[PDB]
Amino acid sequence: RQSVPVASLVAEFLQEHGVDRVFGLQGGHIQPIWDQLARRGVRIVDVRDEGSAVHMAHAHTELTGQTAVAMVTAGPGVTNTVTAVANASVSRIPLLVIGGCPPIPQSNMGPLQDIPHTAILEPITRLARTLRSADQVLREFDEAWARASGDRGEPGPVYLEIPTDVLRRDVPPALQMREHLRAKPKRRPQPHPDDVAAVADLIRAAEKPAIISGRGARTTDGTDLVRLLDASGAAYLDTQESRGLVPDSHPAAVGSARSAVMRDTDLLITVGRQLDYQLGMGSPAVFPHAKVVRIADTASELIDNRRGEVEILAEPGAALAAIADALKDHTPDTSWRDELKAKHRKRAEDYRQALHSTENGADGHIHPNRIFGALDALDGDVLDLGETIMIADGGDLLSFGRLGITKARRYLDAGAFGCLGVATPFAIGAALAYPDRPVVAVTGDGAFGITATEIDTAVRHDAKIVVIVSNNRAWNIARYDQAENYGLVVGTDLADSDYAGVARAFGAHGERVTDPAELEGAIRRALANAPALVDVVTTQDAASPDSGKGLGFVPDYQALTPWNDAEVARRQ
Amino acid sequence: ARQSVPVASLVAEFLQEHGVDRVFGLQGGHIQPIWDQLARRGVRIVDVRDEGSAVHMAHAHTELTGQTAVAMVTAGPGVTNTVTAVANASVSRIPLLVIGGCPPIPQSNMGPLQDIPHTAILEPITRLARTLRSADQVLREFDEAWARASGDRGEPGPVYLEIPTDVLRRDVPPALQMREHLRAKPKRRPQPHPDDVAAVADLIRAAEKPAIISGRGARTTDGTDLVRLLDASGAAYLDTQESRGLVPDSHPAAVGSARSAVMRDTDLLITVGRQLDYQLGMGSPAVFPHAKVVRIADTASELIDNRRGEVEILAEPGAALAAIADALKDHTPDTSWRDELKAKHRKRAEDYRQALHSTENGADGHIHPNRIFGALDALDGDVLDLGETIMIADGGDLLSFGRLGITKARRYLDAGAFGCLGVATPFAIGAALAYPDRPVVAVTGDGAFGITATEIDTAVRHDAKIVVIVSNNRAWNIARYDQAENYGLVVGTDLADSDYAGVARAFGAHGERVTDPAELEGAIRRALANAPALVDVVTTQDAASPDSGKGLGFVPDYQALTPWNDAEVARRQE
Amino acid sequence: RQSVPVASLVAEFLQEHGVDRVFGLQGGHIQPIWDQLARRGVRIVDVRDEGSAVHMAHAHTELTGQTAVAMVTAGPGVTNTVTAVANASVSRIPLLVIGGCPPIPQSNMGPLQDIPHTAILEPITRLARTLRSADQVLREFDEAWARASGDRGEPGPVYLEIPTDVLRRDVPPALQMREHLRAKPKRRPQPHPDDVAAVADLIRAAEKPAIISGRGARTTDGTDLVRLLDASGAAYLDTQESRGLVPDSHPAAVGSARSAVMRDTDLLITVGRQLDYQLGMGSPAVFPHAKVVRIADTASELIDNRRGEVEILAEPGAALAAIADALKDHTPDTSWRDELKAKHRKRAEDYRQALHSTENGADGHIHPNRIFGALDALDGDVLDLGETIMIADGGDLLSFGRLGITKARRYLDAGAFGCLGVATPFAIGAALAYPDRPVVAVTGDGAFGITATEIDTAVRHDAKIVVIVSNNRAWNIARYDQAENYGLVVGTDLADSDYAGVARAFGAHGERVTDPAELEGAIRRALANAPALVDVVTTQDAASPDSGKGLGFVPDYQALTPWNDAEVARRQ
Ligand SMILES: CC(C)(O)C(=O)SCCNC(=O)CCNC(=O)[C@H](O)C(C)(C)COP(=O)(O)OP(=O)(O)OC[C@H]1O[C@@H](n2cnc3c(N)ncnc32)[C@H](O)[C@@H]1OP(=O)(O)O
Ligand SMILES: CC(C)(O)C(=O)SCCNC(=O)CCNC(=O)[C@H](O)C(C)(C)COP(=O)(O)OP(=O)(O)OC[C@H]1O[C@@H](n2cnc3c(N)ncnc32)[C@H](O)[C@@H]1OP(=O)(O)O
Ligand SMILES: CC(C)(O)C(=O)SCCNC(=O)CCNC(=O)[C@H](O)C(C)(C)COP(=O)(O)OP(=O)(O)OC[C@H]1O[C@@H](n2cnc3c(N)ncnc32)[C@H](O)[C@@H]1OP(=O)(O)O
Ligand SMILES: CC(C)(O)C(=O)SCCNC(=O)CCNC(=O)[C@H](O)C(C)(C)COP(=O)(O)OP(=O)(O)OC[C@H]1O[C@@H](n2cnc3c(N)ncnc32)[C@H](O)[C@@H]1OP(=O)(O)O
Ligand SMILES: Cc1ncc(Cc2csc(CCOP(=O)(O)OP(=O)(O)O)c2C)c(N)n1
Ligand SMILES: Cc1ncc(Cc2csc(CCOP(=O)(O)OP(=O)(O)O)c2C)c(N)n1
Ligand SMILES: Cc1ncc(Cc2csc(CCOP(=O)(O)OP(=O)(O)O)c2C)c(N)n1
Ligand SMILES: [Mg+2]
Ligand SMILES: [Mg+2]
Ligand SMILES: [Mg+2]
Ligand SMILES: [Mg+2]
Ligand SMILES: [Mg+2]
């Protein structure tokens, strides 16, 4: 070891921790680190808006399991990340944001961009610190990295900033400890056999067990989950954050039976999943028959809203496998599961077939379902959807996408936070992580306007993305809530903008589609010329399931009207 | 068959159902609705003279019993009087619940009586700090906060809940009162991964001088799996103030008078439920120059701080210790380093303990405080069983003398890593009410005692059989010493020759003064037979504790003590 | 100038800012400052509990107008001040708390007493900072001092901490600027003549104008206030924080007519006073006839709860004088004022006379009013109450004191915060500020137990205080609310403690009184042998006005039942 500046040690820490790319937007306050990363051969993915850098890191970590890194300058560089940080905090995604900040001598004197970054981010981070001791910077980075995994909290974003004078200070070689530089393995807490046995007992007693998966299940490869489904005879639901773990053809996979599974299950088993608004707060109003069991590697997925008759705090894979083993010699009763599955096959197959022929709305424009029809028709022709990363974003478009996207290797979307604008940044992070296939993002026009200039970033860094815009000249789920519940549409219309032209202005391939029969051809050309955008002129006369269920209205007790009605009855 | 009842009734029931049989507090209007309901269910109310003392009593209760304890305080100054005791619990990572009063929702921000931002003041030193504005969700919020106090979504420590008085009085329909939120919950038991267990056993097989240092998380076990691992590993053993009492004094590993020698030479430091904070030299290579590091804990607050393990086990510590012991089944440890320390320890500790009975008066003619520990040792097996006694220490010099003078105790409590002066009397009261059969003896500096002296009243009114012994040296003496030695000017560190026995008698406790060291055993004997009691010992200012000699008072740049700091300064210049 | 350590410059800053005493409790982290203060001859008033030091500083500033200073060590030294800081923040009293904290190199490493002091205090301070730049420490002190006066906020407490390594760092002489060292005058914003004229117009139109005073009025000597009372014919009420500004014999002074003034005034003029719970939130329910005008040097006494038809933001003295001048040639209609005054003379005189002969309660013990009777009887004999600083504290005792203490040079009490325990610390700060007269504090036994050991501090520093304890073996306003509203008394009884014995154990003169006829003699002996305590064995059978009006109950909308009833009617 030799005496080297803090900036050098930070670049080395990152590379040794397995960071081969940093997302960011340059400023003077972070230039010392930016320079050292480039000199070590860490790829710098520079963006048009720092928020997008943090979104890219989110997508990288969620897909790969490797903690990802954004770097931004002081002041507006940091404040531009708050949305993307909050989004990662809600989704419990490990990531590190490195911020610039003013030299220590000028503290509180009104130097350029002295604002309280750590106080702004503290509520939505696992850690937010200013590092004022050159010798301790390495230690602070390693500890923050561990806290991003969930140590002393739960998985999510961490923020570190180093005053520019400290970045330039040398650290003597004695104080540069290998144990802080090196990569660390993930923790693997194991289940207690008595909890495993108690869950197996509940499964044996249940007639309609159901497993709902989430983030923590999606950190596994799905095989231990499938073992437990086979051993238990449980029905299976996933969530936006846990798609892709169980084959569609599995006798448990009943994705078109969400309401029926929740209404009738007598044993809800959550696997790395919150009982947040997406699952009716786990309310007895939404699960009127269910006993509850919770399995997770974080109490953020054990204690919220409902408590388990058993709760297992362990690596979910190990817990699923242990419970499967414990059900050695059990003959599951699968008759409810099988009855749902027979209905599911009809419902899901009729729905997927109908995507190819959805009528234009009353305004003469494409129904957005035809986008998902066209993608389905191209499967096995010009792309393999089973190898493809799919992304959805928007309001009505997002709700249609949840039903229209049925084969994907991986799925990302606006998340429980409802974070519009993720589509393009996510696509870029996904595409640079998995350079072999195009990544396909389908987005509302409203959501796309937030991050459209990142098309430039995809072109400059050669991220092979296809963006498909549902261009309905509107914030349409908003416009619909305005008409139905208020009788006045105001400030929710957009214009017939040329998003293909925006894409072409930033060097991407672009095409506009007004005729639904042109979709397959346009998506074929976009895939062969990624990065590319397909601007689809879509109808305003198409209510998504989210629209129909009052998501826009914000009821008192539940996100959706039917759940809220059930909660009002429970409360009497 | 549940009925519609007020939030205040549901809170009292939640607490009782979670195993709460006592609440420490001080009444105010904002919390009276809960206070009343606790009394009507038969939960004992231990009312104090200062809310901070209530939170100290809860801390002592949880630390000793493992049962999360509860303090209840009114809005405004009731809540703000808890901040020190909350911070203390936060540093020590002790689960506890503080329930605060606060103004009715309609008056928010309007200058109602005692509207201050309690949650913002406490957020930095709690695992959770919330105002509960939805009557039907109060039970849920209590149960989740209780789990966060155990360490869920954070690490063990204090949580804060406050319920606006209008919410306390609102009815909750019976369908919304869920059994799953009312019922007591078992502690979590994450288990070790066998590959980590194997990797630690491999490091132990390869070490020549393994050493285990225990802390809080070890002290949550009964010590028997720790002993199994000591036996299988041949490791030397050190404890810390927060982990006394787990290993028999005569165990071949127990080498408490060889602290420097263990740290200087160990080639494998194993932390068990212990932080590498200032009390262990930040785990610095300057203080552990030969050590590989392994960390075992049920919380990463005792795995990632300052040093990283070659292996880190995140599990219930008992299970991890037992697993590693099993893995060493056929290992024959090399115990020659441990045994050589142990032989020197036996003599050093025995000579130290013997000399306590005869320590000379200082140049000012007053008792050396070590004679307090001599007297207690002399009474062991006569009028008290030290092995069954909860010992407490507090102060500056007195506390440092206590760390060597208190060697036999069932359990030990003190000022903590936070250096929280004034814990002695509140801790003794919580300890005595938890263990009413048992001797409870607290030894304190005069300076520390003045912070919570009026709690003697609480001990008398609630019949807490405590003995407080005051090292009355008319000074904040570790401070006075640092002033003289490093600054050449003693100012604002002298106190007076106060009659602390008279203070105790004024509050209906037994009290006696001792000026002659030969009177100490008799005065402590009379105090034990007449508890609650105070013994006011007139002690010397001419007596430097180890803490005093090592520069604790000076606050060096890198380490709490001069010798460690010198070692760190050398490390920084390689 | 020469190169000197930060610790030296801090001691010099304080002395040059007019600080001749610092209240505190020693620790290693602040020893460098403590030492330098002593070497410059600043008196160190060392206490038994840091909270008491901050209370002492509060009392000094409230009485003298000089910003006062407490100094405490890291960790529990700082956390022991939070109550006294909150109290000063509620009362808007300028003061500076200097805290110790760990050296910068050990930040976040678990050094001794590293807790987030600034985050704990930020919500109840005008400023809370860690000072990490030796050269900028002086500047930070001067700016914080200004913010304690109300610059960039409103008057109140500020907190500064200096890491011990920074305290020991030298500052070159160039960077030690005279402008930061020197004392600064208070600000004196002036009224706008059009606002002055608009208030005079409202007074001319009013038939029952009333002035209520507060903190900002009490920063004046009362003479401009009396000029405006004379010019306006207004009735006058003060509050606990504004006693002593208007002679008792003034035709406006109607202190026994509080309810009548609020019910019937058609023009409420607040002068440096909040419309907080102490004035019924200024609700139309409590002031049903009143137009509102607000005068203050801080918007903290202009915008809360009621807005003025006119609001004057100015030095209150100047504003009162300007409005008096503007009422040149007005003949006030004083008939309502005079009618209140005639009733007030009877009510207040009967009340004061009855204090001398109040019967023992049913339990055979002294009614606490006899304490105020005895003090009244000694006036002009062994003390001059008109030159005496009176302090009250407790529950029932505090409410009796508000009526029983009618002549004092100055009055302090538990404040709008209801801060039990202030009595002894306040008495000590008052006595060291005004060494010529004994200071008299009357306290409940409950409140006294919080700070009783400060009797030691009064003895060691020779603060000539007399403490009189209403020893009713109870938190009695609490016990009464328990009996009346709940039918169960539990955890509100105390014991028949020997507080005289506690005082004597700390070297003070002490005496116990069981016979009300012994009060004058005991108080005479206490005054001649201060510091002294008189332990009065008092009745539990005595409801204070606060007790009778439901203060203990905490109604939904107002602090007191009758105000709350009026608010409930207003809300229908
Ligand atoms: C750090 C990084 C890169 O990551 C960032 O985030 S930078 C953020 C984006 N940039 C900014 O926000 C700008 C920040 N800096 C400034 O605001 C300015 O540099 C300053 C206020 C600190 C200094 O500005 P000046 O006081 O130098 O003002 P200017 O108006 O820029 O004048 C420059 C020169 O032109 C002169 N000048 C002005 N008007 C002129 C005129 N009309 N004709 C000729 N000369 C003219 C002026 O006198 C002066 O010359 P001199 O007297 O120093 O030689
Ligand atoms: C409030 C506002 C407007 O300002 C916002 O900010 S909104 C923010 C942007 N939007 C979001 O972030 C979305 C938030 N909402 C949601 O995530 C969802 O509404 C929910 C998670 C709360 C509830 O979703 P569901 O549990 O209904 O799940 P979906 O996958 O949407 O399925 C809807 C229906 O289609 C069904 N379905 C699923 N896949 C199918 C398939 N392949 N074929 C046929 N039907 C299928 C499914 O069973 C169900 O029907 P049913 O069982 O209720 O009858
Ligand atoms: C800064 C200020 C003044 O403002 C404050 O606020 S201070 C706050 C109040 N004080 C505290 O909270 C104490 C803080 N400090 C400590 O906790 C300790 O100094 C330390 C943890 C940092 C260091 O303690 P040690 O590791 O030195 O442990 P001790 O138990 O005190 O042992 C001291 C010595 O006695 C030895 N010893 C222990 N038990 C013995 C026995 N039974 N017989 C003989 N010797 C014995 C022990 O080995 C050692 O000698 P050596 O090996 O260094 O020579
Ligand atoms: C909630 C709990 C118990 O947990 C707490 O924490 S309480 C905290 C400790 N207590 C406090 O901090 C006190 C808080 N409350 C108050 O400050 C007062 O209740 C108040 C400011 C809200 C209202 O006080 P008032 O405006 O009633 O003022 P007082 O000076 O108390 O006067 C009471 C009555 O005596 C009258 N009075 C005043 N001086 C008199 C005199 N000299 N002779 C005769 N009568 C006199 C006065 O006019 C009035 O009678 P009326 O006009 O209403 O009929
Ligand atoms: C940053 C932000 N601001 C507003 C909103 C609120 C919202 C959620 S969905 C929606 C309409 C989306 O319009 P889009 O054109 O993308 O989709 P479509 O319905 O198919 O026309 C809005 C305004 C959110 N969640 N995020
Ligand atoms: C609340 C608080 N304020 C100050 C301090 C700083 C301190 C730590 S030790 C000490 C002196 C203790 O004097 P004592 O009389 O108890 O013991 P002895 O040395 O034997 O005479 C001080 C002032 C701490 N830690 N906490
Ligand atoms: C730190 C704090 N904790 C509790 C309370 C709540 C309270 C306000 S008044 C009172 C009773 C006071 O008893 P005392 O004996 O002093 O007076 P008396 O009624 O005449 O017997 C309590 C408990 C407050 N405000 N502050
Ligand atoms: Mg933005
Ligand atoms: Mg749209
Ligand atoms: Mg002492
Ligand atoms: Mg206190
Ligand atoms: Mg009382």
Author numbering:
A (entry chain B), C (entry chain B): 16 to 587
B (entry chain A): 15 to 588
Quote the passages of the study that discuss this structure, keeping the authors' original sentences.
Actinobacterial 2-hydroxyacyl-CoA lyase reversibly catalyzes the thiamine diphosphate-dependent cleavage of 2-hydroxyisobutyryl-CoA to formyl-CoA and acetone. pmc2-Hydroxyacyl-CoA lyase (HACL) enzymes belong to the thiamine diphosphate (ThDP)-dependent decarboxylase superfamily and catalyze the reversible cleavage of 2-hydroxyacyl-CoA thioesters to the corresponding carbonyl compound and formyl-CoA. AcHACL is the first published HACL crystal structure and forms a compact tetrameric assembly such as the OXC and ALS proteins. Interestingly, a unique feature of the actinobacterial 2-hydroxyacyl-CoA lyase is a large C-terminal lid domain that, together with active site residues L127 and I492, restricts substrate size to ≤C5 2-hydroxyacyl residues.
To study the underlying reason for the deviating Km values, we have determined the crystal structures of the enzyme mutants E493Q and E493A in the presence of the substrate 2-HIB-CoA and inactive cofactor dzThDP to 1.76 Å and 1.63 Å resolution, respectively. With rmsd values of about 0.1 Å, the overall structures and the substrate-binding modes are identical in the mutants and the WT enzyme. As expected, the conformation of the Q493 residue of the mutant is almost identical to the one of WT E493 and interacts likewise with Q41. In the E493A mutant, the glutamic acid side chain position in the WT is occupied by a water molecule (W3 in Fig. 3B). Interestingly, W3 also mimics the WT E493 role and interacts with the Cβ hydroxyl group in the modeled first intermediate complex. Thus, W3 can compensate for the missing side chains of E493 and Q493 in the E493A mutant. A closer inspection revealed that substrate binding is suboptimal in the WT and the E493Q mutant, since one methyl group of the 2-HIB residue binds very close to the side chain of E493 (2.9 Å). In contrast, the 2-HIB methyl groups in the E493A mutant structure are further away from the W3 water molecule and the A493 side chain, thereby allowing a better accommodation of the substrate. Compared with the WT enzyme, the E493A and E493Q mutants exhibit a 10- and 50-fold reduction of the 2-HIB-CoA cleavage rates, respectively. In contrast, the only tenfold rate reduction observed in the alanine mutant of AcHACL is somewhat surprising, as a >25,000 times decrease is expected. In line with this, water molecule W3 is well coordinated in the active site within the mutant enzyme and may substitute for the E493 side chain by acting as an acid/base catalyst during Cα-Cβ bond cleavage and Cα-carbanion protonation, albeit at much lower efficiency.
